[PDB]
Design a protein around this ligand. Sequence first.
Ligand SMILES: [Zn+2]
Ligand SMILES: [Zn+2]
Ligand SMILES: [Zn+2]
Lengths: 489, 41, 69, 98, 24, 47, 103, 96, 171, 45, 58, 46, 172, 57, 304
Amino acid sequence: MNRQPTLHKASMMGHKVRVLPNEKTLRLHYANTGAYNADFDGDEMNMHFPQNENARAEALNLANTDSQYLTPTSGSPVRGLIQDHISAGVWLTSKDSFFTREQYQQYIYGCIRPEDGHTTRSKIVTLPPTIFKPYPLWTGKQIITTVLLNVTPPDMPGINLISKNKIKNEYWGKGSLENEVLFKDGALLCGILDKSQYGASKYGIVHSLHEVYGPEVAAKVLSVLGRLFTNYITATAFTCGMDDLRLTAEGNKWRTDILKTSVDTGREAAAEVTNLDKDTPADDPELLKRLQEILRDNNKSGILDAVTSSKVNAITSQVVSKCVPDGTMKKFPCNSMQAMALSGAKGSNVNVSQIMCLLGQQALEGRRVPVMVSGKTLPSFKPYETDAMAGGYVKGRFYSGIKPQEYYFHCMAGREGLIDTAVKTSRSGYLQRCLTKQLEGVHVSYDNSIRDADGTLVQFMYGGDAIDITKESHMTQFEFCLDNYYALL
Amino acid sequence: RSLINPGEAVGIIASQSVGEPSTQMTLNTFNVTLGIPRLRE
Amino acid sequence: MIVPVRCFSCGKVVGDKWESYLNLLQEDELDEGTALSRLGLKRYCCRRMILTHVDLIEKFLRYNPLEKR
Amino acid sequence: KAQGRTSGKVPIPGVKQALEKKEGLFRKHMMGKRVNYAARSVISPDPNIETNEIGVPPVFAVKLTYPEPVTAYNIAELRQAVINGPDKWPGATQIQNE
Amino acid sequence: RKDVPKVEGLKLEHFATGYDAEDF
Amino acid sequence: RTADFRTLERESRFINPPKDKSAFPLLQEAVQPHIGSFNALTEGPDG
Amino acid sequence: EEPDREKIKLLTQATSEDGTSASFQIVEEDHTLGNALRYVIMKNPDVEFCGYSIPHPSENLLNIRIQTYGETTAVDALQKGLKDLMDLCDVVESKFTEKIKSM
Amino acid sequence: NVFSRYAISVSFRHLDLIADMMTRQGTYLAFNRQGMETSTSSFMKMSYETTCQFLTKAVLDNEREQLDSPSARIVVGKLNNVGTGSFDVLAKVPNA
Amino acid sequence: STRGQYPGLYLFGGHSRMLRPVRYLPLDKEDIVGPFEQVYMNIAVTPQEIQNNVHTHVEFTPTNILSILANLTPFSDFNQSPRNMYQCQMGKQTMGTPGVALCHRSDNKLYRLQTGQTPIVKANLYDDYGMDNFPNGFNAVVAVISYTGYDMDDAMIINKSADERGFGYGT
Amino acid sequence: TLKYICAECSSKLSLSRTDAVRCKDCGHRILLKARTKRLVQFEAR
Amino acid sequence: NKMSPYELVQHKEESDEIGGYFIVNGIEKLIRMLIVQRRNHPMAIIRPSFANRGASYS
Amino acid sequence: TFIRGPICGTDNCPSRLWRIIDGRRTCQYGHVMEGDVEFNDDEDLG
Amino acid sequence: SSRHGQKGVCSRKWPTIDMPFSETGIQPDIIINPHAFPSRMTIGMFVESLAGKAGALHGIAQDSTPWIFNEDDTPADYFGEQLAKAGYNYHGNEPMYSGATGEELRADIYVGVVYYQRLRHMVNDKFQVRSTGPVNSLTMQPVKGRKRHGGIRVGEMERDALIGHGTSFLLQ
Amino acid sequence: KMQYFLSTGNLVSQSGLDLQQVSGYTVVAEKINFYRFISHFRMVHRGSFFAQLKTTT
Amino acid sequence: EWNVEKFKKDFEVNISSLDAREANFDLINIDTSIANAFRRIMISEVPSVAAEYVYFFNNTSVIQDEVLAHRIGLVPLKVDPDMLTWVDSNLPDDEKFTDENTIVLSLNVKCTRNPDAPSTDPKELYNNAHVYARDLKFEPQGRQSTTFADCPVVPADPDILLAKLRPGQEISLKAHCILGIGGDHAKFSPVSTASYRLLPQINILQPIKGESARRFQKCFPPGVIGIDEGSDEAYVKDARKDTVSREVLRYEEFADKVKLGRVRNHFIFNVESAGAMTPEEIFFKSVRILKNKAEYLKNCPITQ
Ligand SMILES: [Zn+2]
Ligand SMILES: [Zn+2]
Ligand SMILES: [Zn+2]
């Protein structure tokens, strides 16, 4: 299978056929869509079907997806669950999750079927509940224990892992320990599961099962969790609304008062670069003469941009650092806009800040908004205006709206991200083609020397240690290899 | 057991591990030549 | 074109209410929200199908190659 | 390596222009061939197939074929493929004689 | 700047299932 | 109210096209750079 | 004498030797009966495990799985659940008849 | 320094093999035509760029292409010698 | 100025000049302003932003600076800027209504969406250009929910019975 | 009786062989084919 | 040219027919507008492609 | 559906042929003619 | 696609019954994933969803000319007041139930009426397949072009991606 | 000779016009919807010479 | 400990209203798995009659043939099921339709110019310019004459506008109306919408009497909360009347003094109809389908 700009060898992997009814589209799983760099917006992929048994033995053993878990660029994993299986494991493995007996047995068999060969025991084994006396209830962490109890081999003991999350402890309350992931003898005992555990992230739970149990088990656990966080989503959904994007009236007064202290910021940075002082007014004729002097020089305008941008990025960083955990109406678990950004499911904290607080400085080609010959950045503004807004600082957010002047600068910044993309791929495309003709018959020999195709020697070992990059991940993780000594033996 | 295997195409891999993350640094000024034009020299 | 027979979302028959709707707005002179509630459309799925219909078939029918223009 | 007469919209290519470009011969039809037994289509998501799997449509599944030599162990399945023929999916499109 | 003019003449137009205009 | 869909104004116009003057005059102004530029070949000063 | 036997099917690859654990596969079903029947099998005090699972939504197949403790096989728990769902639709139909005859 | 500026980690084993290719003649050779000029495979050079320029240098040389580079084995259709073509499979027959 | 553009006073009245209307602040009348003039003027965007003794002009509406198709995007000042630019390209590539006089034409191919609808949420320039004569799309009850699992990275889920009753059907 | 239709005056028109393709009331060259009573079947889907 | 929306319908056109294009062989092409330099006004450009022209050109 | 052609081999019959996989003209009875092609040439006046 | 650049292919014609259903009985025509909106920042689609549902209930059209509203005149306050007079939730949320299981969902679902468009390029003129077919006369290779039943290209870089796996028989 | 220009877009001229390219002067008015069609008449183009450049100014 | 005799002690039905077209009623103390299955079967598994195969002899109008074939299939027919049987698909088309499977409708409309005095209304101006759904006439094939003599086949909504015509144009078709279910196509669904909702529960926590109780009224539909005095202060009259707007949860006075939830085994079914069957009779069919969906698995051999 093949995504068409084939920039590295993991973009052409080998799949097993599963013929479906009622379709005309090739149909893919979400673990693969980060490897191919594909998304479901209308992308096409090429399906090649090999015609002898020598090639079938190499689409199963050399180029299959199970051996392509780690990329050879740095040894980092590229296969994992992507967007909404991430944001479902922050609810399933939460501390609020309590399932009854009918529900607990339904999420096990929803993802682990013995008939299709998912189990290792041919009889689905379960756990005692974590609450006995009022009503028997299972915890949501205890489902992740049961699915690892069933898909891992019975003779090997459980996994042992101590890792972290992407979610800080203070989003959960006072004295929570939900940042610490803990597996002891294959049982999840502490901490929620994120992108940092079963996403495409290093030293998670799926990366650690890959090391102890092998690539065939680590490819099953992504399928088992792919079905687990789909039946839980269908029973317990996940949405994002208008109330997720609103600051409370206490916190909405906070961003007004900090942005009230930005009307002086443009002049003070402009009074600094002109080497005046004392808060000289903006209409000073000995000030406007210097701003025209700055305007004609490309050097001096670079200084005035850098001073004023770094001075208004402080006010941008004061509004965000006061509002976005605290000024919001819905707090963390219920505010799905933050939980998509904290879990690493989709977006960043920069996207949440521009929605809820303000856009910030619209930096163009690194510098700032360009300027006409007349000292005007738009026809709306006075010539040589030392306003921060006139230089391209957007005090508006996407929740409430941006003014027509600052809608025009934001289209300037939007277009330089699109003309730079059109000139992006042509640059590094020829750099890669040019390497792959010299470094193209270069291979590891049987005496571990790296040689060219004609036999000329290039290196005497691969990197000085002859270690494959896709193998040396836990090689220097000695604490992990000691906690799992018998399972790794 | 973590050694490189003989016959491994370490020349294609080393070239695909440089050209492929270089489709990620086409950007402008944030003193020395930066990014792809430095890499093209 | 012509009004859809059924609503897309619920599936109530909606196609019999287009000509009754234009009588209410023209003859009885109601606003759009009161004429839709008198026809029985009350879920906002079927409510926005009579409300938001263009009826381009009256513009297509002007071109008739079967009679003298 | 000629002079020509006029602007004949890049005149008639010689046997060197058939070799030296991105297109031509040595990069378009030796390093870059087109292949039999291949299909492409728009991709769609599925969390119900495995991670090491692809969902092939039934349109592609009745076109792409594999030459399977008939022996004493696959005679029970290759007879059923010829009976179904090239329309019913566990089937076959043609046989090859000795 | 004048605000967006509020549309005057709105009323309840969503009711529970099995209740039409039993509200005054 | 703020804006309206002009439902009786469309339906009287679909059935009965105007016999005097084009409605939607901003649409004929949006090709005045093209129609006007061809009209200037034969009309105006000096023929 | 042609009774249909392609409807319910015992998957022998996941069935225990005693019969106390077995998986089934009904054709032409989904969450409709797959969830309504799973509710009633779980009310048997001998059923240790029960759940349905639709392997792919694009085809009409329904895997259910019953695991018991003892002294009742997993087929005898399936047909006990199917009898108590037949008897559960009699109660709904006969209460709803008596409230139309009472209006 | 290029990749660590953009917070991109590449392994040093790739960078040592790029560097030990560029310094394979004691000089500082590029990846271009002029760096490729000192090589054995003629079809690698012809397939890269300026095909009939390298063909002129090979025909005057009466150069025997040994058919070992993977750009020269795809031309003649020989099995590539990297990976599963780096050895031979020989079948062991029991009778004399 | 000092080392600016060469000074002068340049009148132009020829063909082919770009021109747009603004409001001249004394007399409250429409003025016509071209792009050579505009660099040295002071045109207020809204009348609420008229400052004393710098502004001589004001826009009629701030929506006189967008295109026709960029002005039909609902609440375009809330989207991110590459998404308003991408709708302007996606709005061309829809199958809508090419025209009503289709039985008197013969084109290579036409795409015709069958049952179009006007939008509930629309601009006031949707009715000035007569965009109701060419309905391009339909009003869907859309739910923002991750429910099925088959809707990731861009993909969406249509309803089946909505489709059987004809939902974006076209020839 | 097989007929066509003029594209201009919409007059029905039987057109024999060794006749120019023209209307015979006006003189219009373009001439469109009518449809006759003939069975086609559909599924109502 | 001077023709009503009623009469455009009687002559087999769209009632709000726009014009502005040419019909060439049924294909319905039009002339693309171009951006060119402003007429009749001396611009004062500096350009590195002028020293390319001859010796001692600035 | 068929087209007239030469007699098929394998002692078939005097036959008429038919291209089926766009490059393999079979006979009437399904015998693929050995070594057949159906060439073309590529354009993606001017 | 909607009017905000939120495009994406139809992934499954999902059957009606196991699709979530509101308090009203309304089942949505289109389910769109909330994980689009954090990286897209298309909040015009949230307020179009909120103004469209206000407009269907009250029988009114709403204006969405840009810069009509204000930072002191937020449309979430303007259209939410029109929903609250209609009898719905202020924030456009609705209580929905799961079509598969039958229980109510965890929280309320953001529902509304969005004007969807249908783009012109579909799978029926994208997909192709070839077992064998017409060849070229010079190179005896498969021909370019879909309507001529032609072949998929294994270009320059896909050669390198198969040398990189070390599979010389797939390359062969 | 004027229909040839409006069919291809090739500005053939002995005397030389002031313009800097000789192709792409005319394009097909598509009718996939009305928004595609109304935007050909508002479309202005800097010049087909400038897409040949490697500068994004 | 569950038992079907313990289910019967605690199962109630309160029928709020019944009508020719809709029915609102309660199902008290039943599980969500069973109550969903009745909703699930009313939409899909209950069969109804709709037109399937349409035979155009002429369609000279503006509407396409397959679009106009699609519009006939969505027209709901006032036919009782269990007057037809099921079609059989493993046998050819001459043997497939009988007088026991099929209802044959036909449509024959021609449009002509009308001489009328004069922008005039096109019903005064043309003859047969609007094909309504009542013009689909029923053709009794075979013995559908002594068994459909009580009830001819008429569409359930006879004023559905099927097409519009202009003079010269005509429509002449013939359709076969076969029996099918809503899972196959949506046009066989015998219900506009069947759905349920849980009974809302509004739990006041503190006494909120007085002026607060007057503003507690307005956060709900008017019949929901009531008052009497400072005593009998602010109580729930009709929680079934409430739509869960959560209007009270956004005023900071009340955000700790009330909690909203559901009664998780009290379902409020609202079963509408497309006219073909009464809505209380597509619920009896729905509970008998689930019973007969279980007998066919019990009375069945367990293969392999
Ligand atoms: Zn509806
Ligand atoms: Zn004529
Ligand atoms: Zn033969």
